[PDB]
């Protein structure tokens, strides 16, 4: 639950930039799913979460397929759906989806905003846990994302390290 280190943002308002996009979706769907992921952790935190259109931001989103720049390289269809960097500097924080997945707003394989969700939990400290409920569980588990409200466990979770 608590990533190792307990690394944590200083600020409480950070910046975000969706720097491409997947073209099984329209920028406004992935803006959509991208903002409320962000929002599922703001309404549980202090953090606040503000957009960019261009320029660094403190969480970089990008869509990109297997070799892209980290060397935490993609894998094609299915397998690994995306990762974020825990809070630091320059990746920190940054989070990138596998543009070769087949991306939807909706509860099909792969539901950007449950992943987006999840890996935004990497770009604030949170580590994986163990219950399979919670949305930082390490695999995949569509969950109702219209109602969709942040797990107890993540809850606990980002509380833990945000207050
Ligand atoms: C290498 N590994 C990446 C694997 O790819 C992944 C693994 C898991 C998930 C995931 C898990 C639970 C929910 C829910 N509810 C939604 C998405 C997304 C991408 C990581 O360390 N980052 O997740
Ligand atoms: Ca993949
Ligand atoms: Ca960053
Ligand atoms: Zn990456
Ligand atoms: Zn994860």
Do not use: C
């Not at 903002?35 to 990109?64: C, H, M």
């Amino acid at each position: 639950m608590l990533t190792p280190g307990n690394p944590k943002w200083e600020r409480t308002n950070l910046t975000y930039r969706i720097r491409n996009y997947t073209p099984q979706l329209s920028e406004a769907e992935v803006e959509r799913a991208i903002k409320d992921a962000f929002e599922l952790w703001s309404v549980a935190s202090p953090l606040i979460f503000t957009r960019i259109s261009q320029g660094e931001a403190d969480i970089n989103i990008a869509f990109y397929q297997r070799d892209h720049g980290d060397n935490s390289p993609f894998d094609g269809p299915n397998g690994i759906l995306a990762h974020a960097f825990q809070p630091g500097q320059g990746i920190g924080g940054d989070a990138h989806f596998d543009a070769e997945e087949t991306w939807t707003n909706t509860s099909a394989n792969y539901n950007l905003f449950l992943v987006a969700a999840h890996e935004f939990g990497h770009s604030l400290g949170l580590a994986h846990s163990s219950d399979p409920g919670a949305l930082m569980y390490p695999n995949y588990a569509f969950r109702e994302t219209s109602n969709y409200s942040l797990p107890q466990d993540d809850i606990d979770g980002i509380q833990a390290i945000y207050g």
